[PDB]
Amino acid sequence: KIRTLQGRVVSDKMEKSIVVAIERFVKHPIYGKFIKRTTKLHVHDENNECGIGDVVEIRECRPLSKTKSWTLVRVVEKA
Amino acid sequence: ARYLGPKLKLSRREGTDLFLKSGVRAIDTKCKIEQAPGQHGARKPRLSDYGVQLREKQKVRRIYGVLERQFRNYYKEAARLKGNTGENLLALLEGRLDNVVYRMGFGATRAEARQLVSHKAIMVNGRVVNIASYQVSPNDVVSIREKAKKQSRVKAALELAEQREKPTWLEVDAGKMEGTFKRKPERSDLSADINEHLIVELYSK
Amino acid sequence: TSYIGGEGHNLQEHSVILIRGGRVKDLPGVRYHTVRGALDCSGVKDRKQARSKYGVKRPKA
Amino acid sequence: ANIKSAKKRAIQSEKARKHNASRRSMMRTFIKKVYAAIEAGDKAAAQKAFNEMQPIVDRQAAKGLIHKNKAARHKANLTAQINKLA
Amino acid sequence: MVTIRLARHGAKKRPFYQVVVADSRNARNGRFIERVGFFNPIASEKEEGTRLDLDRIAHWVGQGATISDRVAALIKEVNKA
RNA sequence: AAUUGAAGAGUUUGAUCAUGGCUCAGAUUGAACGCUGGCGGCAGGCCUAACACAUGCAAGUCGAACGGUAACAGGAAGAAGCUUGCUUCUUUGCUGACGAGUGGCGGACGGGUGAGUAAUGUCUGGGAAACUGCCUGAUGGAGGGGGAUAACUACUGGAAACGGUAGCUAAUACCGCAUAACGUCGCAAGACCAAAGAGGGGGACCUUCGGGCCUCUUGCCAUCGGAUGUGCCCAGAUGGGAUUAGCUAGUAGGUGGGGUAACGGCUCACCUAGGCGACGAUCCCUAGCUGGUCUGAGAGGAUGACCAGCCACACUGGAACUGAGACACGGUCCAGACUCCUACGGGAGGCAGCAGUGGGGAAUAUUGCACAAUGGGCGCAAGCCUGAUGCAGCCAUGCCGCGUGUAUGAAGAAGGCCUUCGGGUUGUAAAGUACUUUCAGCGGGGAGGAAGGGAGUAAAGUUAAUACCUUUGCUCAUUGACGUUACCCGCAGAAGAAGCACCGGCUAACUCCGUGCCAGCAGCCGCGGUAAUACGGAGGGUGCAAGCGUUAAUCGGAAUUACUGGGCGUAAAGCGCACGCAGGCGGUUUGUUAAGUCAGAUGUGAAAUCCCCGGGCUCAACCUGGGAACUGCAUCUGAUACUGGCAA
């Protein structure tokens, strides 16, 4: 199986692209609490179908634009 | 690097003999051991806990002729070694080549044994060692070189040693002038007036 | 502003001195001493104890 | 310079720069001829210019003036131009 | 070329070379790829004064690594034994 | 086995509790300064001006690519002698070789510095759209020509630097032509793309005696694959400030063209109006990053000197050229500031390479020796170069070790100080006696760092071929700067070798005299006004010791930023009170998921350093072998109680 991630779309204004917010669950180094941290990845989107607020599953690939190295694989759900 | 001062002042300070003289005669007729040295000797000294710890450290150091930096290295090594730190420190102190020579009786005092060691009159396992702080390991055969077997120092030292207690963990000869260092001496075997947890606490301070 | 220790100095104006830290308590704001015996701040005349603190060479035995 | 090897290398670098500039200008001239053939619209002229060009860029790639990747880039780009031209 | 050579460590007057497979451009005591053994020139007798990892050295030679002169002598002597 | 480790004290008050700061006791340093200073080992030594540089050296090599002969050796002839050829002398590149030149490789490494750089860098993990000289394996091919141009010759410009014109010559210099493929392009048909020879020996046959001809070594050129190196992308982490809140116009995306070795707004045109930011964007101030180092019980905190990995820079600001690799420390070009030469037209240079000079500063070293070793460049090789590196020089800068004597020795000697004047202390201390000689001084002997390489042979292969050559052994004579090395023996004699701080409490160690809130001490409490254990001197004592203190700096103590590990009624501290988005947290049962979580495995987490078990320097410092550790991260396989999601 190939490495991948799964996140939530926050913007689809880009043409043939989406912005995906991926939340990770990191234990704080000092205080030991498990804090939410969210990374925003510009995800390539051929066809352009994903909407704002859907759970999409993405994979790293070669660079595609200035800030787009990730791309879709499948849409987990529609929202 | 060596305390080249009067010796009995140290014994007078600590209130007890440190064997800094040969032992041909009792030290009472050589110094007022009951009285601390100096103008204010009869003064009754109320010592603090730090006073107690400091004097204990000094006493043992003066006995073996060790200076503070070297003794601190001994303490660090004893703490590092497994087991009881105080007994490890005492064992490391006993392992010193000058002390081994003293115990085996080739020196009337530890200063005499130290000069014998430093003048290449002592061999270990056959090789000449002139390091007064060489660590003697188990089973070593501390010897006297042939060109130094004829010194009246060694004789007088042997007949002075014979009238004291014989260290169990050693085997000495007066003819061949060798000694097997059977084992490491134990805190139980050594003199029980030395209270080394005072040194331990002091260096933990 | 620098304190000058010792028993009497010989520092006139324009003297080239070497100063070190360590304030003087009873003096307002004086936060430095002058190292005796350094460049011009010559040693105290006729000391016998703590000569190294006042730049006095060992008197002959 | 101030080292004999540096001086000799400077002379050699200048001479090689002149030679390589000559060859590079020739290669660019032929590629530009091809490109003008496409952008003027003609197809047979474009293909003929491409056929004249291709040995030049391949020979220069072989000699090291450029890289075989660069030669392939020019070749593929111009061939796609010809075939889309019609 | 990747070379198998001696990086000198130890102290003054007492060398102690480590046989390392490294790029020939790096510094002598600098970046290496693998440590394949050691050599003590003042090795006292009874102690293993020279140890080479001949399987790894052969691996590197097969990969094309060149062998320094002193390392070649050490390999000859060790495989002679 | 890879650890076993955690101290408090003073000070607010008439006194006591508590809160709370301030201060001291410890460890350490790239240290400086004061006093003092015997030896050795190992290490370290411009932290400031990335300020300016006199001077010498720090990158060359190859005649086995080439023309050639400037010099040397000088063999023949010829010079031409009585030396009958050891006369300078003339010719011959004839030979060994080799200045200068073409050409190949190196100069992009090694070495220095931390100015810039707060994330276009670094660390960790993961990738794809990639080049990679020398090295290596396999597959192949190495045919045939052409025109040059240095060198040199002649003329000639310039003060010089530096050229210019005409003529000639060689190549493994350069360019065609032939030949292509599993190579490029193309769907395919098909089209297209390279090369360089040199050296050693040899029969027989050719022989213009060049040489052909035959084998051998090596080099050349496609192409594919390995290894190393490098380029590129993503994620997390990587300082302070919010009294810096909005920033962005190729800006974000798309398409198409161009460009790179390679993906890419890398660049351009057009079309969309986006992109980032309260999980801190933008701006501002400092700053190289890491392994690690210091401290700490630990968590942490501070810092990243030496050593090693990465990056960046090379007088300042820019550019590209050659090159496999640079936008290049000792290369080019341009501009600029300095400095120097000039014939006034013009030129030259760049120590943050080693050493060194000036200056700055509290402060940091020799204008040394050698390529013997390790490594590097070139070379088939010898060998040449190497201020890398190995050593040595100066410095107590640090760590470690050793010595300055050992004992016996009361006449408790004198002297000194205190005295209650009776004595006590200095003090077995000295003197005296006997003994030893480490280290330093002198003399004698003497490891190891030395492997290789040179000559010849034996074998072995090769090949007609004992010939070369390539291995492998074999005997020979050698290769060490350090270096009068480490070390060992002998000498003569205690002989050449102890100081610094402190003594009111904290804090180990106490009395006289001088001074009289003065002189002064001081880290805090404080001390000093005529009996000062606190100032200064003396005796005595304490601590440490070739060091000892002061200062600077960090952590500790400080639970005094409290995650481990604090508080908020009155000591500082609950918003005046509510509502409430984001955010934090979430009652109870079943099912499912496996994110968190846990377990196991795999890959990495460089080496060194720390730690454990050992080994070697006479021990230690130091150097090493092996382990452990590197708390991490990425997958994979399980558990799924608890949290999370999902559905009831």
Ligand SMILES: [Mg+2]
């Ligand atoms: Mg010492």
Ligand SMILES: [Mg+2]
């Ligand atoms: Mg120039």
Ligand SMILES: [Mg+2]
């Ligand atoms: Mg500097």
Ligand SMILES: [Mg+2]
């Ligand atoms: Mg350069």
Ligand SMILES: [Mg+2]
């Ligand atoms: Mg060529």
Ligand SMILES: [Mg+2]
């Ligand atoms: Mg800076």
Ligand SMILES: [Mg+2]
């Ligand atoms: Mg703590």
Ligand SMILES: [Mg+2]
């Ligand atoms: Mg400069």
Ligand SMILES: [Mg+2]
């Ligand atoms: Mg190029």
Ligand SMILES: [Mg+2]
């Ligand atoms: Mg460089």
Ligand SMILES: [Mg+2]
């Ligand atoms: Mg330079």
Ligand SMILES: [Mg+2]
């Ligand atoms: Mg310099």
Ligand SMILES: [Mg+2]
């Ligand atoms: Mg100055």
Ligand SMILES: [Mg+2]
């Ligand atoms: Mg030798």
Ligand SMILES: [Mg+2]
């Ligand atoms: Mg006290």
Ligand SMILES: [Mg+2]
């Ligand atoms: Mg008085």
